[PDB]
Symmetry: C3
Subunit: 50 residues, 3 copies
């Protein structure tokens, strides 16, 4: 039962690293998408004034 | 070995909460990006008709 | 203590599947957002030349 638990300890450690980095990726994708949304809104507003 | 397992139980519980909320963040980033893509496509189509 | 550990094994397995698929979702949201950003930049550049 000792090895079983340390295989879990490792798995959880690996998952933790994967979830932390995915959080950074999600934050970045969120920021990118919001910036694209605002730029597309600007383009369309400039088009309305024409 | 009892404490080792309850440290794992906790870790897994925490990770679960982190992955659920990241799923909501990913869904939101996906939706945002698709909306930006469509708005940018609209801008460029309006430009083509000019 | 045997059942406790196999409940964990399962939980970790499930989480793994959730994190892998979220990685695919994040990669997709990242790509989508970058594409929207570039299209919005194109729209705004075409507007500048007008």
């Amino acid at each position: 039962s000792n090895a079983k638990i340390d295989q879990l300890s490792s798995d959880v450690q690996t998952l933790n690293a994967k979830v932390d980095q995915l959080s950074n990726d999600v934050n970045a994708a969120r920021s990118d998408a919001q910036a694209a949304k605002d730029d597309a809104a600007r383009a369309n507003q400039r088009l309305d004034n024409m």
